[PDB]
Amino acid sequence: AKKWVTVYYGVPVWKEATTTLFCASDAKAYDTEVHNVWATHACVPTDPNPQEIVLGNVTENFNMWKNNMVEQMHEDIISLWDQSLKPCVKLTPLCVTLNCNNVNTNNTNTGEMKNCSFNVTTSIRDKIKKEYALFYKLDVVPLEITNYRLINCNTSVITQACPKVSFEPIPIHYCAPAGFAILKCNSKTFNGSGPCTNVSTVQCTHGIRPVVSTQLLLNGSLAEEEIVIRSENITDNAKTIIVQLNEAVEINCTRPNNNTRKSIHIGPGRAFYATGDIIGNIRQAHCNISKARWNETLGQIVAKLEEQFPNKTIIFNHSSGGDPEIVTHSFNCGGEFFYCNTTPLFNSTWNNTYPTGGEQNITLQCRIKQIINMWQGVGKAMYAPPIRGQIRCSSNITGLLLTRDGGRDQNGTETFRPGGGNMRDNWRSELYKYKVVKIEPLGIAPTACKRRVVQ
Amino acid sequence: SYVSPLSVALGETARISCGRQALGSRAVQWYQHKPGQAPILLIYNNQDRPSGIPERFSGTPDINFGTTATLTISGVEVGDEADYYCHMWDSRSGFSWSFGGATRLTVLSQPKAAPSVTLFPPSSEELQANKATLVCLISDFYPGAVTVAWKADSSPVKAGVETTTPSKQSNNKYAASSYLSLTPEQWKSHKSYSCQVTHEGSTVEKTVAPT
Amino acid sequence: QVQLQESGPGLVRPSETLSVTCIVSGGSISNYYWTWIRQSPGKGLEWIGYISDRETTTYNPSLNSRAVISRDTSKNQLSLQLRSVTTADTAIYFCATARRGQRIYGVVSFGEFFYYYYMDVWGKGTAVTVSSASTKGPSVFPLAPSSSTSGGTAALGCLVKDYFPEPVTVSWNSGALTSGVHTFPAVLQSSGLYSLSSVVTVPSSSLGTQTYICNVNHKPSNTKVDKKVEP
Amino acid sequence: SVLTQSASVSGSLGQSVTISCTGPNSVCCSHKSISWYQWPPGRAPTLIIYEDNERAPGISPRFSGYKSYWSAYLTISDLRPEDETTYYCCSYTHNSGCVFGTGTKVSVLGQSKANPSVTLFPPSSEELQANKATLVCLISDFYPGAVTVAWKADSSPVKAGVETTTPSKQSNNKYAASSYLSLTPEQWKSHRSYSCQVTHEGSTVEKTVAPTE
Amino acid sequence: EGQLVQSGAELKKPGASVKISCKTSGYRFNFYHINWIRQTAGRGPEWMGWISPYSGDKNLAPAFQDRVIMTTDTEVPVTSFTSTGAAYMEIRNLKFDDTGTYFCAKGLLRDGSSTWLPYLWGQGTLLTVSSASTKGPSVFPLAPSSKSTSGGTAALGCLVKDYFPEPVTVSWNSGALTSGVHTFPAVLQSSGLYSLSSVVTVPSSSLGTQTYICNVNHKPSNTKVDKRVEPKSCDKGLEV
Amino acid sequence: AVGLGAFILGFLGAAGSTMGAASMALTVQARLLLSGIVQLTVWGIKQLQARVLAVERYLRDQQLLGIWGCSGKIICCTNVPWNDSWSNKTINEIWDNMTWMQWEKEIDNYTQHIYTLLEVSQIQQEKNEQELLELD
Ligand SMILES: *[C@@H]1O[C@H](CO)[C@@H](O[C@@H]2O[C@H](CO)[C@@H](O[C@@H]3O[C@H](CO[C@H]4O[C@H](CO[C@H]5O[C@H](CO)[C@@H](O)[C@H](O)[C@@H]5O)[C@@H](O)[C@H](O)[C@@H]4O[C@H]4O[C@H](CO)[C@@H](O)[C@H](O)[C@@H]4O)[C@@H](O)[C@H](O[C@H]4O[C@H](CO)[C@@H](O)[C@H](O)[C@@H]4O)[C@@H]3O)[C@H](O)[C@H]2NC(C)=O)[C@H](O)[C@H]1NC(C)=O
Ligand SMILES: *[C@@H]1O[C@H](CO)[C@@H](O[C@@H]2O[C@H](CO)[C@@H](O[C@@H]3O[C@H](CO[C@H]4O[C@H](CO)[C@@H](O)[C@H](O)[C@@H]4O)[C@@H](O)[C@H](O[C@H]4O[C@H](CO)[C@@H](O)[C@H](O)[C@@H]4O)[C@@H]3O)[C@H](O)[C@H]2NC(C)=O)[C@H](O)[C@H]1NC(C)=O
Ligand SMILES: *[C@@H]1O[C@H](CO)[C@@H](O[C@@H]2O[C@H](CO)[C@@H](O[C@@H]3O[C@H](CO[C@H]4O[C@H](CO)[C@@H](O)[C@H](O)[C@@H]4O)[C@@H](O)[C@H](O[C@H]4O[C@H](CO)[C@@H](O)[C@H](O)[C@@H]4O)[C@@H]3O)[C@H](O)[C@H]2NC(C)=O)[C@H](O)[C@H]1NC(C)=O
Ligand SMILES: *[C@@H]1O[C@H](CO)[C@@H](O[C@@H]2O[C@H](CO)[C@@H](O[C@@H]3O[C@H](CO)[C@@H](O)[C@H](O[C@H]4O[C@H](CO)[C@@H](O)[C@H](O)[C@@H]4O)[C@@H]3O)[C@H](O)[C@H]2NC(C)=O)[C@H](O)[C@H]1NC(C)=O
Ligand SMILES: *[C@@H]1O[C@H](CO)[C@@H](O[C@@H]2O[C@H](CO)[C@@H](O[C@@H]3O[C@H](CO)[C@@H](O)[C@H](O)[C@@H]3O)[C@H](O)[C@H]2NC(C)=O)[C@H](O)[C@H]1NC(C)=O
Ligand SMILES: *[C@@H]1O[C@H](CO)[C@@H](O[C@@H]2O[C@H](CO)[C@@H](O[C@@H]3O[C@H](CO)[C@@H](O)[C@H](O)[C@@H]3O)[C@H](O)[C@H]2NC(C)=O)[C@H](O)[C@H]1NC(C)=O
Ligand SMILES: *[C@@H]1O[C@H](CO)[C@@H](O[C@@H]2O[C@H](CO)[C@@H](O[C@@H]3O[C@H](CO)[C@@H](O)[C@H](O)[C@@H]3O)[C@H](O)[C@H]2NC(C)=O)[C@H](O)[C@H]1NC(C)=O
Ligand SMILES: *[C@@H]1O[C@H](CO)[C@@H](O[C@@H]2O[C@H](CO)[C@@H](O[C@@H]3O[C@H](CO)[C@@H](O)[C@H](O)[C@@H]3O)[C@H](O)[C@H]2NC(C)=O)[C@H](O)[C@H]1NC(C)=O
Ligand SMILES: *[C@@H]1O[C@H](CO)[C@@H](O[C@@H]2O[C@H](CO)[C@@H](O)[C@H](O)[C@H]2NC(C)=O)[C@H](O)[C@H]1NC(C)=O
Ligand SMILES: *[C@@H]1O[C@H](CO)[C@@H](O)[C@H](O)[C@H]1NC(C)=O
Ligand SMILES: *[C@@H]1O[C@H](CO)[C@@H](O)[C@H](O)[C@H]1NC(C)=O
Ligand SMILES: *[C@@H]1O[C@H](CO)[C@@H](O)[C@H](O)[C@H]1NC(C)=O
Ligand SMILES: *[C@@H]1O[C@H](CO)[C@@H](O)[C@H](O)[C@H]1NC(C)=O
Ligand SMILES: *[C@@H]1O[C@H](CO)[C@@H](O)[C@H](O)[C@H]1NC(C)=O
Ligand SMILES: *[C@@H]1O[C@H](CO)[C@@H](O)[C@H](O)[C@H]1NC(C)=O
Ligand SMILES: *[C@@H]1O[C@H](CO)[C@@H](O)[C@H](O)[C@H]1NC(C)=O
Ligand SMILES: *[C@@H]1O[C@H](CO)[C@@H](O)[C@H](O)[C@H]1NC(C)=O
């Protein structure tokens, strides 16, 4: 009938706190070992067997928008990039001016890949050579003999990424340190921020690929049953809408130009790689998306958009308010960075939920660059070395990024704009289900147990 | 500029390379032209031939890029010998106006034919017009390389001699004619006039005398 | 099933407007394409220009300056006109019925297809000369039979004296005799005129009562001459 | 019910009172727990005792439990006016539902007397229009229990159309009751007055209405 | 510290079926059993059964094992330790003796020896099984009567007459008048119909500053009666 | 009820269950409280600082359990009475109607005070008397 405190070691008590998570990537061992930037294997390999522990009777509130795991992953990508550019060639003496000719092509009724000629001091400092190269139009801007320079030379320095490192995304796992654990939602239709009914705990998150992208998302996690429209504030137009797909739609992008790789000696031991003379037919890089599969995927997105919205509802408009890098769906495949015109992709008009004889494969043209300032990162730019041969790749699209028009003070129904407001939202699209907590294994409690008297 | 020569054995198949090779996907036309006659195309699409063309001719389709557009001629005979043009239409080059460089096909080891020389004295009505011309006609000789030498008595003429360059006829043999302009008094002066036609190592001579 | 017939002067003074006509009998002009190809001696064929079925011209950039091509709707004939001709413009003129193909090496919507033409039907071809010199009509001298070879084979013919207009047509008995005929090519004499000969090989049995007459027509001189040949 | 309690019991103010709860050995107390509930009629009950002696959360220490091998008891100490109600025990195991008892009504003695409030209403004029006439005699705020009601027509008893309700407890721990006399307008108009007589064991109160006024 | 709110009172004919709901709030609905207990005049309080919202398991008394169908919904989360839920109870083959009051009750403990013991109880659902049809009441005004001449108090109210379904509801001034209200229980006439009275005690001087309106709602008949009590009284003691 | 070595409830296996339920299996959150036991890049300093943080937090608990007379034991009883000002619930209400979570959220106010009372009133007093009693 008397109560005495009794301390316990190992109590199931956790608290929400922030820790410095680390990476987990399975072992890739090969003779032709090519190091990877986005997920270096310096981080500990994942366990051979994943261990997930279900937490019955737990109701925990998740908020993907306040999650500190996103802010850390976004900071891990930035610092992982710069460590691969430091030991590679920087194109500082290549800011010399260029006299450029348009590519040879018959005008059916202009040219963007272009051609240029410039000087290059050899490995020896006094000698001077003169060679030619082929630089896409977006990478060079004129100064007045139609003289030219690189787009970045008056802005900042530029470094050429080594050809050894690969620009492909491999699944990454985020493990929390000992004494902590990660809580994972499992509700089939889990609203963005709220309570998750049946939760579980895991030490390392599932295989997340770090795919840098804009507008529509690629190679993500597909939610089951009906699709979901996660938003921090569906009533505020300034808040980004994240969308999720249930069925996987496939995208097919190729660069048909069979280019070549010319090694130029701009300095001692520094080989600047550039595009050689084109071989074969002149062509532009396109992307194909089956409209029969995009039509159904679009018809389901408006339904979930008609649920968050009134019964009288209409459809969207596209891509106005930023730089041409924001306008186009930017990503990477094979090594070249595409920038696709997504006008035909959102073309439709639905009412209470385009051409009947329209062509089978939707096809968009994608302008390619080679000088990039990604994640809005001003300063040292990166030069993507040209890829030998023909480029062909196919990805799965798993998510979109929209944005409301923003009516001034009144609404003529409603329109939506595809917009990548921030690069971090590409991580919220996969870190919505995870959350980090610390374990407090100290628990005082009363029982009718008094320790032995002092004797 | 000028014509490219090509020599092939009789009956053996042959191939004809095409100048200014394409830089991308191409649709080449092959035209068979004989001097003075109408040109006939054998292959409008690199693998397609119109109705009437025999199956001996064929062209190289461009299934995979890098193939060279050649014109194959199986069973090379007398009739295949002509000038061949290769029209080019690639995707990299603009409007291709000109035709390809001509290709002079010559069929080898074709049997030689002895020439048929025919000498004609000047007509009586031509003499009334105070002129006289000797007509020496050569026909049905294959090796187109005859040298015509004239002889007045035992003396070469060497003057007023006009001779055609050999031209092929319908029999695929060549044909040449030599003309010797004279004055009616010089024609009446000499005993006889001779036309010597040297063909290969051989030589044929015809002689005509005034009445 | 399509026949083309070229007609023209065959002789034009320098620095004047050449004209020609291409008569079609197979089908309508508004269904296929037409073009003109000339043949100059010592040089390869040359494509000068073409006309579409909806009447749209397109000329070779080297002749682009002086060439105009038209087609008549009432008459199935296409006319050619060349201004400021020289004696290099002298050639055998071919009109041909061209038709169009479409070569696509990629997607049709983003261009990536080039049009190529080919002329499947050709005309006989007309000859045109350019020279400041005047027209010279030919005179006909008969070549009497030598009375020649054993077995009865003998030879006669007709001589055509010097003329400058190069094209010359020769027939026999108004085209009644075709065996043994062999019209030889004309020779360009130092006089500046051409001269040809036409022989016919016939048996000696019929060499007496043959009544062989050669018919020498000529167009630039506008003269038709018939000559009797007898031993 | 096979679980029998004492039909009634009484205790004085500020004193204690004990209630019993016993039955056959099929509903024995040795191998089953006993829980007590305070169940005022017309309202939701409240758990005061669960798993025998241990009391529910919030229950004052005045309540206490005890269970013998043959019966169980519930002792209410320091009686209050609100403790004057009905009580049930319950027999249950962990996986077998509850078996309620017969019931026990507790009466607290040593009480203060409350004077009865009597009010009599005549039938409204709108009611007399439709040929109906009903007298309403309302009684309220009497601490002494069990009231008796009597009706009279011109100082003479009535027996046709008399309906009297059972006594009901007021929110202020007092009691209330009502009675109705259904009549015809001829009986209503042919009499000089009607009376509702409320009789208690200590004093009798009478209220009279007259159809003339 | 949660509230249990049950469905309203219903009137069904014998032989039919009825389904009662019990919406919860203020606690983890998955952590406690939901007991169903009824109370009739012939058998007293009778326990019917309980059901588990987390496991779906149910125990019914054999007296109700063949006629009670209990179901639960899925809890709707509110916070981390509270939620809202709903429990259902379906009874078929109704008889006249089944007429009484039905309760749903929250369990006691999550673990232990009395995990299902009914602890928190709802307000109870009144079920009447009769072959007669619904009858609406007739409301009459009760003229003011004197309560204390020296104290200056009076009493007025409204009368309810001849309504068949038992539930009765009376309010004053749309709920703005709650002090001094005293509602009396109903009477069971020999015809089967019910009737009761409601009276409120107010000062006698409050006649030109306060409006008195009795609002009678009889939801089984879907009838609302708003009667204005005439403040002019016939009592000679109150006229003084 | 009771699992005889095959319960595999796992790390935080019963955080939604009652306090008395989860208290029976507290070696699962004990071994797995220091699971990190089983090159200048970012993953090097992020891992080396994650290892040293884990070892530093583990040594905080064993530090407190050392100045409490509990170093070896997972469960250990005390001698300081439970003031009802901390919580006023019954031993049937705490260990059968509450999970460690909501329970710790109720006594979190007073923990730092109890952590003091625990080490001064006991173990510090015990060792002083354990020195005096064994003197004779
Ligand atoms: C999350 O939180 C919830 C709280 O809602 C937890 O649920 C609670 O679990 C505890 C522990 O298990 C329960 O305490 C026990 O409750 C027992 C009563 O229910 C069990 O057994 C009965 C027996 O069923 C038969 O008999 C019935 C007679 O009433 C009859 O109705 C039925 O049809 C059967 O014929 C089952 O009815 C009941 O469902 C349950 O377990 C059974 O069913 C489940 C699911 O269907 C199944 O998986 C099981 O295998 C089993 O078949 C009670 O008997 C028991 O007391 C006895 O054991 C305890 C051990 O602690 C001992 O202390 C005691 O002395 C007895 O020996 C104990 O009281 C509690 O009732 C549950 N509460 C609710 C509201 O569900 C849940 O566990 C938790 N989850 C996690 C992951 O932590
Ligand atoms: C999808 O995700 C959204 C989040 O983006 C969830 O939104 C919930 O919306 C409700 C709306 O009622 C919010 O409730 C609001 O809570 C405010 C304060 O929060 C405290 O109290 C709430 C009690 O509900 C606690 O949950 C919370 O932890 C805090 O302790 C109140 O101040 C609000 O009331 C005020 O405004 C309203 C009008 O808007 C007035 O009527 C009030 O008088 C007062 O002025 C309001 O009650 C809730 O906080 C949001 N989050 C939840 C519930 O987790 C959606 O619910 C979610 N949907 C689904 C299906 O998951
Ligand atoms: C939203 O954006 C999308 C993406 O572009 C548009 O979809 C395209 O719409 C265009 C028309 O705007 C479509 O192009 C049309 O193609 C037809 C071809 O189909 C015929 O021929 C093919 C073979 O080539 C057959 O297989 C088929 O059975 C048909 O027989 C053309 O007939 C159309 O011609 C029209 O335009 C041309 C050129 O301008 C004119 O010369 C014609 O006179 C005529 O006006 C047309 O070219 C295209 O197919 C659609 N894409 C796909 C993937 O199918 C939506 O139209 C657009 N919606 C808007 C803007 O409201
Ligand atoms: C894209 O552009 C690239 C150019 O960068 C181009 O690759 C080139 O392909 C040609 C083939 O047409 C290669 O030429 C080869 O050279 C090698 C040198 O060792 C030879 O061995 C090859 O012949 C061999 O294989 C034959 C196959 O049947 C054999 O039969 C033969 O006996 C030999 O074993 C051949 O001559 C050229 O080297 C490459 N250039 C490179 C790789 O830089 C490619 O074809 C283009 N593709 C498209 C689709 O446009
Ligand atoms: C509660 O959340 C859990 C957490 O994931 C969900 O459980 C998952 O349910 C799926 C059902 O298709 C299980 O998939 C299958 O599991 C079996 C058993 O391991 C396996 O043999 C199959 O290959 C497949 O993986 C999945 O295991 C399970 N996840 C876990 C971690 O147990 C569940 O859907 C949610 N709903 C409920 C009602 O609990
Ligand atoms: C993107 O879409 C593609 C559609 O092709 C999905 O490909 C699927 O990938 C899985 C895993 O590799 C395939 O399963 C495996 O197939 C191989 C080959 O037959 C077999 O040997 C293995 O045992 C296994 O079954 C699956 O077949 C394949 N789909 C199809 C239609 O073939 C891919 O999963 C999608 N990715 C994302 C992220 O959505
Ligand atoms: C994007 O590219 C993918 C893959 O390159 C295309 O997927 C292909 O789609 C067809 C659709 O029928 C598949 O055909 C299949 O053929 C097999 C064998 O006969 C048959 O059993 C199946 O039922 C089906 O008919 C094809 O396998 C599939 N994948 C590949 C590798 O070919 C897709 O069409 C493209 N989408 C675009 C361009 O929009
Ligand atoms: C969605 O597509 C529509 C297509 O019409 C876009 O509407 C156009 O919006 C521009 C905005 O600048 C209008 O330009 C106008 O410029 C004048 C200059 O004085 C100014 O006074 C107007 O207030 C306006 O800004 C343009 O007129 C309008 N189109 C037409 C036909 O009038 C719309 O902007 C697109 N929305 C998005 C988010 O892309
Ligand atoms: C890009 O420009 C350079 C410079 O004009 C071109 O280089 C010349 O190409 C021609 C072939 O047409 C060669 O004969 C010359 O020898 C090249 N010059 C030098 C200095 O090497 C180059 O061809 C152009 N590339 C393209 C695709 O047009
Ligand atoms: C340097 O390049 C420019 C054009 O880019 C050229 O005019 C100049 O002659 C070059 N100087 C050298 C090769 O020394
Ligand atoms: C969303 O924005 C609206 C308008 O600014 C504001 O009233 C509302 O509180 C916001 N809600 C959230 C959850 O941000
Ligand atoms: C649909 O929305 C329109 C808005 O104009 C409105 O008139 C109508 O009543 C709505 N109908 C429904 C069922 O919401
Ligand atoms: C659009 O939808 C609304 C509401 O469903 C309807 O009233 C209106 O007629 C529709 N208009 C068109 C053009 O479809
Ligand atoms: C797309 O779907 C809508 C609705 O199902 C339909 O009306 C339309 O014809 C479809 N278009 C195509 C190209 O499949
Ligand atoms: C419990 O704490 C309160 C508040 O500090 C104090 O007044 C009381 O004396 C304490 N009682 C015991 C037994 O420690
Ligand atoms: C604490 O316990 C006392 C003794 O029963 C009681 O009077 C008081 O209300 C309780 N307070 C709380 C908050 O439980
Ligand atoms: C202690 O907890 C109580 C109950 O939640 C709260 O009222 C009080 O403010 C807390 N005190 C402190 C110092 O946090």
Q: Which of D104, D108, D106 is nearest to D21 (CA)?
A: D104
Q: Do residue A106 and residue B94 have CB atoms under 8 angstroms apart?
A: yes
| Ligand 4 pocket residue status of A279, Cβ below 6 Å | yes
Question: What are φ and ψ of residue E32, in 5° steps?
Answer: -135, 140
Q: Which of F64, F53, F56 is nearest to A8 (CA)?
A: F64
* Amino acid making up residue D1: S
Strand duo E76-77 + E68-72: pairing: unpaired
Instruction: Pinpoint the alpha helices (H) of A201-353.
Output: 291-307, 324-327
Tokens of residue E82, six digits: 């509270």
Strand duo A98-101 + A115-121: pairing: antiparallel
E47 in contact with A, Cβ within 8 Å: no
Alpha carbon of E23 to those of A384, E10, E71, E104: distances in Å?
Answer: 63, 17, 12, 10
Q: Does an H or E element contain D173, and which?
A: none
Tokens of residue A22, six digits: 């680390």
| Ligand 15 pocket residue status of F83, Cβ below 6 Å | yes
Of E131, E159, E188, the position where a domain reaches its end is E131
Distance (Å) from CA A343 to ligand 7 centroid: 25
Q: Which of B180, B196, B193, B113 is nearest to B147 (CA)?
A: B196
Nearest protein CA to atom 13 of ligand 12, as residue: A311
Strand duo A180-184 + A434-439: pairing: antiparallel
Tokens of residue E31, six digits: 């952590």
Q: Let me know if chains A and B touch, i.e. at least 3 Cβ pairs under 8 angstroms.
A: yes
Nearest-angstrom CA–CA distance, A374 and A217: 16
Tell me: do E154 and E54 sit in the same domain. Answer: no
Tell me: do E120 and E147 sit in the same domain. Answer: no
Q: Let me know if chains B and F touch, i.e. at least 3 Cβ pairs under 8 angstroms.
A: no
B68 in contact with A, Cβ within 8 Å: no
DSSP-assigned states of every residue in C106-161: S-STT--EEEEEEEEEE---EEEEE-SS------EEEE------GGGEEEEEEEEE
Containing structural domain, residue D185: 111-211
Tokens of residue C103, six digits: 């070569």
Tell me: do B2 and B45 sit in the same domain. Answer: yes
* Amino acid making up residue D103: G
Number of H-type helices and E-type strands within chain E: 1, 20
Nearest-angstrom CA–CA distance, A226 and A308: 14
Q: Which ligand is nearest to the CA of A222?
A: 6
Nearest-angstrom CA–CA distance, C47 and B31: 13
Tell me: do D91 and D17 sit in the same domain. Answer: yes
Total residue count of chain D as it appears in this document: 213
Domains A1-92+162-208+433-455 and A213-422 in one fold: yes
User: CA C203, C206, C211, C216: dihedral to nearest 10 degrees?
Assistant: -10
D-F contacts (CB, under 8 Å): 5
Q: Which ligand is nearest to the CA of A191?
A: 2
Whether A336 and A391 have beta carbons less than 8 Å apart is answered as yes
Q: Do residue F12 and residue A19 have CB atoms under 8 angstroms apart?
A: no
Question: Chain centroid to CA A416: how far?
Answer: 21
Tell me: do B121 and B139 sit in the same domain. Answer: yes
Question: F-contacting residues of A 87-126, CB under 8 Å?
Answer: none
Total residue count of chain B as it appears in this document: 211
Q: Which of A5, A16, A10 is nearest to F113 (CA)?
A: A5
For an interface test with D, give the residue of F90, F96, F97, F98 to mutate (most D CBs within 10 A). F90
Question: Chain centroid to CA A88: how far?
Answer: 23
Q: Which of A183, A200, A204 is nearest to A26 (CA)?
A: A204
For an interface test with A, give the residue of F40, F58, F68, F82 to mutate (most A CBs within 10 A). F82
D57 in contact with F, Cβ within 8 Å: yes
- By C-alpha distance, the chain D residue nearest E190 is D163
Tokens of residue B95, six digits: 């409007």
Tokens of residue C188, six digits: 């360009």
Please give the angle made by the CA atoms of A114, A118 and A119, to the nearest 5 degrees.
165
Tell me: do E44 and E155 sit in the same domain. Answer: no
Give E110's contacts in chain F (Cβ within 8 Å): 18, 96-97
Residue to substitute in A237, A317, A404, A417 for testing ligand 8 pocket (most ligand atoms within 8 angstroms of CB):
A317
* Letter string b/e over residues F50-62, b meaning 16 or more CB atoms within 10 A of that residue's CB: beebbeebbeebe
Domain ranges of chain A: 1-92+162-208+433-455, 96-160, 213-422
Distance (Å) from CA A442 to ligand 5 centroid: 32
Tokens of residue A273, six digits: 């790689």
| Ligand 15 pocket residue status of F85, Cβ below 6 Å | yes
Containing structural domain, residue B136: 110-211
Q: Measured between CA atoms, how close is A277 to chain B, in angstroms?
A: 12
Tokens of residue A265, six digits: 């000696």
Sequence-separated (6 or more) residues with CB below 8 Å from residue F108: none
Q: Which of A424, A440, A437, A434 is nearest to A18 (CA)?
A: A437
Tell me: do E3 and E120 sit in the same domain. Answer: yes
* Amino acid making up residue A451: R
**Is the CATH number of domain C133-231 2.60.40.10?**
yes
Strand partners of residue E141: E158
Q: Let me know if chains C and A touch, i.e. at least 3 Cβ pairs under 8 angstroms.
A: yes
Alpha carbon of C21 to those of A109, C9, C74, C79, C169: distances in Å?
Answer: 32, 10, 14, 5, 20
Nearest-angstrom CA–CA distance, C29 and C177: 37
Of D84, D110, D136, the position where a domain reaches its end is D110
- HEC-encoded secondary structure of F72-123: CCCEEEEEEECCCCCCCCCHHHHHHHCCHHHHHHHHCCCHHHHHHHHHHHHH
CATH architecture of A1-92+162-208+433-455: Beta Complex (2.170)
Tell me: do E125 and E142 sit in the same domain. Answer: no
Q: Measured between CA atoms, how close is A20 to chain F, in angstroms?
A: 6
How far the first Cα of chain F sits from its last, in Å, is 49
| Ligand 1 pocket residue status of F36, Cβ below 6 Å | no
Nearest-angstrom CA–CA distance, A41 and A57: 38
Sequence-separated (6 or more) residues with CB below 8 Å from residue A244: A220, A222, A223, A227, A228, A229, A230, A398, A399, A429
Tell me: do E94 and E63 sit in the same domain. Answer: yes
* Letter string b/e over residues D165-204, b meaning 16 or more CB atoms within 10 A of that residue's CB: beeebeeebbbbbbbbbbbebebbeebeebbbbbebeeee
Sheet holding B40-43, edge to edge: B4-9, B103-108, B83-87, B29-33, B40-43
Q: Does an H or E element contain C171, and which?
A: strand C169-172
CATH code for position E184: 2.60.40.10
Tell me: do B57 and B105 sit in the same domain. Answer: yes
Q: Which of D144, D63, D147 is nearest to D110 (CA)?
A: D144
Q: Measured between CA atoms, how close is E103 to chain A, in angstroms?
A: 27
For an interface test with E, give the residue of A55, A58, A59 to mutate (most E CBs within 10 A). A59
Residue D50 is nearest to which of E114, E123, E124, comparing CB atoms? E114
For an interface test with F, give the residue of E1, E111, E114, E117 to mutate (most F CBs within 10 A). E111
Q: Do residue B91 and residue A104 have CB atoms under 8 angstroms apart?
A: no
| Number of structural domains chain D divides into | 2
Distance (Å) from CA A414 to ligand 13 centroid: 13
DSSP-assigned states of every residue in D20-86: EEE--GGG-STTSEEEEEE--TTS--EEEE-STTSBPTT--TTEEEEE-SSEEEEEEES--GGG-SE
Alpha carbon of F86 to those of A3, F6, F78, F93, F98: distances in Å?
Answer: 12, 37, 16, 15, 15
Number of H-type helices and E-type strands within chain C: 0, 19
Whether A404 and A386 have beta carbons less than 8 Å apart is answered as no
In angstroms and rounded to an integer, the radius of gyration of the C-alpha atoms of chain C is 23
Tell me: do B97 and B173 sit in the same domain. Answer: no
| Number of structural domains chain E divides into | 2
Please give the angle made by the CA atoms of E175, E176 and E178, to the nearest 5 degrees.
75
| Residue E173: strand, helix, or coil | helix
Containing structural domain, residue E170: 132-240
Tokens of residue A6, six digits: 């009794």
Q: Let me know if chains B and D touch, i.e. at least 3 Cβ pairs under 8 angstroms.
A: no
Q: What is the resolution of this structure in A?
A: 3.8
Please give the angle made by the CA atoms of E209, E213 and E215, to the nearest 5 degrees.
155
Q: Does an H or E element contain A247, and which?
A: strand A241-259
Of D110, D141, D165, the position where a domain reaches its end is D110
Question: What are φ and ψ of residue A357, in 5° steps?
Answer: -105, 20
B20 in contact with A, Cβ within 8 Å: no
Largest CA distance in chain F: 63
Distance (Å) from CA A108 to ligand 9 centroid: 23
B91 in contact with A, Cβ within 8 Å: yes
Q: Which ligand is nearest to the CA of C107?
A: 3
Alpha carbon of A105 to those of A281, B192, D85, F128: distances in Å?
Answer: 10, 72, 104, 98
Q: Which of C103, C2, C100 is nearest to C53 (CA)?
A: C100
- HEC-encoded secondary structure of A265-285: EEECCEEEEEECCCECCCCCC
Nearest-angstrom CA–CA distance, E104 and A344: 60
CATH code for position B139: 2.60.40.10
Nearest-angstrom CA–CA distance, E135 and E125: 20
Q: Do residue A4 and residue F81 have CB atoms under 8 angstroms apart?
A: yes
Tokens of residue F9, six digits: 């409830």
C198-201: Cβ within 8 A, 24+ apart: C198/C157, C198/C158, C198/C160, C198/C170, C198/C172, C199/B118, C199/B137, C199/C143, C199/C155, C199/C156, C199/C157, C200/C155, C200/C156, C200/C157, C200/C172, C201/C153, C201/C154, C201/C155
State which approach was used to obtain the coordinates. X-ray
Q: Which of F82, F83, F76, F80 is nearest to F61 (CA)?
A: F76
Q: Which ligand is nearest to the CA of D93?
A: 1
Residue F14 is nearest to which of A12, A40, A201, comparing CB atoms? A12
Whether E49 and E103 have beta carbons less than 8 Å apart is answered as no
| Number of structural domains chain B divides into | 2
Q: Which ligand is nearest to the CA of A404?
A: 8
Q: Does an H or E element contain A260, and which?
A: none
CATH architecture of A213-422: Beta Complex (2.170)
Instruction: Pinpoint the alpha helices (H) of B19-163.
Output: 124-128
Residue to substitute in A352, A353, A413 for testing ligand 13 pocket (most ligand atoms within 8 angstroms of CB):
A352
Domain ranges of chain C: 1-132, 133-231
Question: A-contacting residues of F 51-80, CB under 8 Å?
Answer: 51, 53-54, 57-58, 61, 64-65, 68-70, 73-80
Of B109, B140, B171, the position where a domain reaches its end is B109
Q: Do residue C101 and residue B129 have CB atoms under 8 angstroms apart?
A: no
Question: F-contacting residues of D 26-55, CB under 8 Å?
Answer: 54
Of D110, D136, D163, the position where a domain reaches its end is D110
Nearest-angstrom CA–CA distance, C168 and C195: 10
